[model samples]
Target: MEYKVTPPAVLREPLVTPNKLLMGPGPSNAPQRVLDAMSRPILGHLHPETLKIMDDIKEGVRYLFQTNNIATFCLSASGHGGMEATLCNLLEDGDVILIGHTGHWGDRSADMATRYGADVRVVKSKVGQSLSLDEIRDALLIHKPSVLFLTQGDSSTGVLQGLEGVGALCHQHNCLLIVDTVASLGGAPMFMDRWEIDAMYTGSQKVLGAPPGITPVSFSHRAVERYKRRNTKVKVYYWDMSLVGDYWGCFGRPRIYHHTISSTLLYGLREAIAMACEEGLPALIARHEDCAKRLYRGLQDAGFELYADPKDRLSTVTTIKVPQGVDWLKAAQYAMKTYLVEISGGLGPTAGQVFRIGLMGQNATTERVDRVLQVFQEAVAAVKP
Candidate 1:
């Protein structure tokens, strides 16, 4: 018998494309030029041109992370892969892990580590607050975990966790520190070598201004040494840093086909990294800070209250407390429908209590911040009782 004669109506039409400003927790607007780079001719994964692009990405990640680690490369997956890569490579069946659960990201790390048979212990902070260094130190003293996982930017609550002394403290306790910068890398201030962060990972979409699906991961000398000492093999094959590193030339070996890396996506990542390098990391971070300051001023002028502490506020994504008598869903919908702007609801602890606004990469600008303020003020009025 023949298959169905007709496919779904969705398949018969052109792709649904709509123009809207993405001002949410992540995936901030990718510049047209970055998309243009993606449109470049595809190359074989191991072709010299492709490897050259990959190597450029490697250098970009090192600069973005401010690290000199050799085990740095792009993981051909979403930002989520970094979580897996960190845990699987670092954890054996009986290893102890301490996670600083600041928000959704920390919860995700804990959940992933458990699957690797890790003895995971999570120390959680209240919503809108970051874990104190003292709290993390106490936990490390009690648990003596092999790894201490923390999220640098908790987008859910719009808080930036402090990392000043955590690295030295973890090392004092014989623990390695892994940071999730998926939402913080380019926009927030990070010094991997100075802070002694063993491993950290970030996504290309956020502050890098690239499309989602590329993960930039770095492992310090200590982090790589720890992975080498693991008793069991990495649980997942594709994310196995040993093989993936060799393919990315992270191990200084002849290139081999571990997997088919997407050359198109790699082009976009290279282009995005090129943008950062051109602008200079310090200037790029300052630009984001300026954008965030504008956003805060706008929100305050519009009578909106922020959710995170002023000292802990993250520059990449802001969480605003939904005003009383305003329906969050309706407010977000009105902003999108009437203003062609996309805002977001909160996650984890602040799910229904706060709304999120992201200012990353190209979207992190004075004019865009003004637009977000206008749209949100109108949206609240549209849905207010």
Candidate 2:
């Protein structure tokens, strides 16, 4: 064997990652039980035990999404991957997709849909605000799109879009409703069935309290039919839900190997879902809402202005105006240096204008929110220009 390419000396160095409170957008800290689950022995991808584990995940996903969807399963990729899968499966060349643009996630979804050959029509809301039902209705009527996309939690702008009557409005316009709950699921209230949501997806991180990678997705019966009658096969073979759904046994057929799913990640997700089930969705969402209120009160007391209106604020992640005369990045660095807390700056359109603080999953607690508030107060004080 040729020895020309040798291993780098850095490979020999021990790995070190400092422990910190993750109060940013996502990939929040996992619970001890979920971390322990990742250390269990690996199982054969096709083993009976592995199938049972997948089944358990399917059941958990049903409760988490509040949908009795047969095609409900986890994608072996991040929330972005979930978006790709959802779009590729439902959209064929020349199909129209109307995206309810609230923030960065909406931009990404529109980009993906366009790449998949759909005619993308974006209905944008004001920054730090949500699109009104009337606005959505007018857009749907004007665009006459076959599919409508909305983000339950617009993390980039910290807007919790009201999904209550949006689904009905879409259905009335002969459009299917799809929602991205990556930052809201398990943290906020969502009833996939009751709301008539045709499709939805969420990440394992964030409110799910698991490490990132697995994305839980669900498609209603209407969505499944739309895909089944597609004019062409899904563009991305890797994200093709017809095949992937079969692997997850969503179609009630003999399971076939689409790809080798990561057993370790699956284990972690299973444990996280178990914990959520134990806590119950209502209680979990209530915890997040309570923490959000605490964060808002503390921020107000500290003389900081919130980015979004009170009615539009997301419970999982919060955006605050970078106080005048204070550098956003400097305050973020101060928080990390002094308290080992992660306070991120804004993304996409809001970049450089705000600070984003996340209180998701394990981090959604009164004590944790207080710690974050303290860091915010001191950091802003220290970094004021």
Candidate 3:
């Protein structure tokens, strides 16, 4: 058969990548060690060495989530895949899910749940604040939902929700508590077992210093039992936790091939997780918190106002209010063009109103934070009307 079209010339071009600082929400630059691991020798998905790395990842995730649940595993998709898995497994037709909507992630969770035939009810908070425990309790009482979704760190508004008491509150109403910690994870303090969180998911790229192709998820015994009792099969086979969990050796059965896992990404994830474990969770979180505080002070000194309230502010991603008469896009672009730094405009509700600056993983350091601040100060000033 003769080819009807010429081969594209673009395929012959070499990849162009300039070294730039990624200080936007998520996908912060991976450490050199992680990047190096990605280029290491590839192995078969079921190879003993690859499976060992997967086992190491399981332990690392348990440490991050602070859970002993045997059902914890990594998803070969983005954080959104983790969300899909959680919702699809928990909600059958007519199930009510109460989402504590604070920003982009909460809205996304509700959207996914609604698509899965869940009756989604949202108790929204103010744009700059997280939901209060009283509000969540009240919503649970009124709605009597089967599941409650909360975003621990909403990058859209840079709000860090306090999940301390929310879990117990959900169980009181006979509901399961599922948390989205994509922006928090290793950067923030989270004790899934202590908080009684039923299911939780987070991305690998944000605070774990890995690339964006992996997601870490953990489910409590209660959550696993609930999935087993579901009246309907999980809608999406790709995200079905039952099969995926078995592939990950989560259920204690012999590991089976659910799909061809990514050996390269898992190698990078293993290295990243090992680095995190070496640093210890407490020191890791404290480092991020310290960097965030320094960034906040610098932003204030530079004449920028913060978007989130002090208590609700997320340390991983900081939301700064775009001053009147100053164009947010111009400032962001100026930062990138002049200094190779990324200061992004908002998504969801805060779009065009704020700039989202992320200091996550390897980027959460005094040096990087100071550099970003310098660039931001110059960028905003240069763009001001």
Per-residue alpha-carbon lDDT of candidate 1 for residues 204-322, written as tens digits (9 for 90 to 100): 88998788887999888888889888777888999998899999998878889999898888878888889888898889989998899999988898788999989888899999998
Q: Which lDDT value does model 2 have at 243?
A: 86
Off by over 4 Å in 3: none
| Candidate 1 accuracy as TM-score | 0.98
All models: lDDT?
Answer: 0.89, 0.91, 0.91
Provide the global lDDT of candidate 2 against the true structure: 0.91
> How much is the lDDT of residue 46 in candidate 2?
84
TM-score of 2: 0.98
Native-vs-model 3 lDDT?
A: 0.91
**C-alpha RMSD by candidate, in order:** 1.2, 1.1, 1.0
> Tens digit of lDDT per residue, candidate 2, span 127-165?
679999889989999999999999999999999998888
Compute the lDDT of residue 137 as modeled in candidate 3: 86
Off by over 4 Å in 1: none
For 281-340, candidate 3 gives per-residue lDDT tens digits of 999999999999999999998788999999898999999998999988888889889888
TM-score of candidate 3 against the unseen true structure:
0.98
